[PDB]
Ligand binder design. Structure first.
Ligand SMILES: *C(=O)N1C[C@H](NOS(=O)(=O)O)CC[C@H]1C(N)=O
Length: 357
């Protein structure tokens, strides 16, 4: 096995020229290895204030937020509050258009509703406008037959999934996921008292934070530090070490396989490829195309496979995050950056580091 000094050398030798070439001001990395987290921090959380990245620095996770949404949805299924087979109209009866009749919660959760678009329009700012948005939408394909990665899809899934609980999405997430896992520095809204930890993101050299939008918490709005994200990876990689609960059950539901596109399998938030897999296949299987693609159905959903590469990418205007783990090998990695850089490069960097273990 690799010593702490040897592992630190591996991470530094890769991250340092990456940050220079990409102009990434700061990065926090966690490697999960031999049951332990290993933290490495580089550069600046706030360039203008000359503030370094630390293990307490908060980064915007962007679409990595969807892994929390998927597990919270799985927890709601285990609580028998929702079923993925249920019609969307069971939870939003005001959605009366004929195009919605055959669409299920499963389709929202896994991007198979038939072409829901990538973003909620910025001018949709209240519930009446959100209703008009989904009422107006015209599908391109029958549900359960195509994939189009979309915040409007899993974002609405997250919002409807917590409806039977009576809680706001943020409340449900804190009470049912964050608190039981002791993710005490993971936030949908960064409290005033925690702002000193909040890194700035950088786009074209300008400091930026993610803008508020409808369904943001569900799709791209979580902020966290490298220690909480290591704990998140550890909980999803080794949920059998948790006490029995609906949350443990929900973690399994989120890593179940619902659809296949090429070599990638769609979970709830999480995406998976069968292990062993070459790095080029992981890169090819983690491009969310602008265009729709057909899917192959996994019916019934397949339970979690320990021999999987499990991962999720995420970005905001100013941040780029990545998490990946292999349960069969009990290794995993978190990479948090305050500049967005290409997803294939995140995969390549992570894959190379995990290979050394
Ligand atoms: C998630 O971060 N987002 C939604 C979509 N994600 O595709 S990705 O995971 O391959 O990065 C596009 C970018 C981002 C967003 N702008 O909402």
């Amino acid at each position: 096995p690799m010593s702490e000094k040897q592992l630190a050398d591996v991470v530094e030798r890769t991250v340092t020229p990456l940050m220079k070439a990409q102009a990434i001001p700061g990065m926090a990395v966690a490697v999960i290895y031999q049951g332990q987290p290993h933290y490495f921090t580089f550069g600046k959380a706030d360039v203008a204030a000359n503030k370094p990245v630390t293990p307490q620095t908060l980064f915007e996770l962007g679409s990595v937020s969807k892994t929390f949404t998927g597990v919270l949805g799985g927890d709601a299924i285990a609580r028998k509050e929702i079923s993925l087979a249920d019609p969307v109209t069971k939870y939003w009866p005001e959605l009366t258009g004929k195009q919605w009749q055959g669409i299920r919660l499963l389709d929202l959760a896994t991007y198979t509703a038939g072409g829901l678009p990538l973003q909620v329009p910025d001018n949709v700012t209240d519930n009446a406008s959100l209703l008009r948005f989904y009422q107006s939408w015209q599908p391109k394909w029958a549900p359960g037959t195509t994939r189009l990665y979309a915040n409007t899809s899993i974002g609405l899934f997250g919002s409807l999934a917590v409806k039977p609980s009576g809680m706001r999405f943020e409340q449900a997430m804190a009470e049912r996921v964050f608190k039981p896992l002791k993710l005490n520095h993971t936030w949908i809204n960064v409290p005033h008292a925690e702002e000193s930890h909040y890194a700035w993101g950088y786009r074209e050299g300008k400091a930026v934070h993610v803008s508020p939008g409808m369904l943001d918490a569900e799709a791209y709005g979580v902020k966290s530090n490298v220690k909480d994200m290591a704990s998140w990876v550890m909980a999803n990689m080794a949920p059998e070490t948790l006490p029995p609960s609906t949350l443990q059950q929900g973690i399994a539901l989120a890593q179940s396989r619902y659809w296949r596109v090429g070599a990638m399998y769609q979970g709830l938030g999480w995406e998976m490829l069968n292990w062993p897999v070459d790095v080029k296949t992981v890169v090819d299987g983690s491009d969310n195309k602008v265009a729709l693609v057909p899917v192959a159905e996994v019916n019934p959903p397949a339970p979690p496979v320990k021999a999987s590469w499990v991962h999720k990418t995420g970005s905001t205007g100013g941040f780029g995050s990545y998490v990946a783990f292999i349960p069969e090998k009990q290794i995993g990695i978190v990479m948090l950056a305050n500049k967005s850089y290409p997803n294939p490069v995140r995969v390549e960097t992570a894959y190379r580091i995990l290979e050394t273990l």
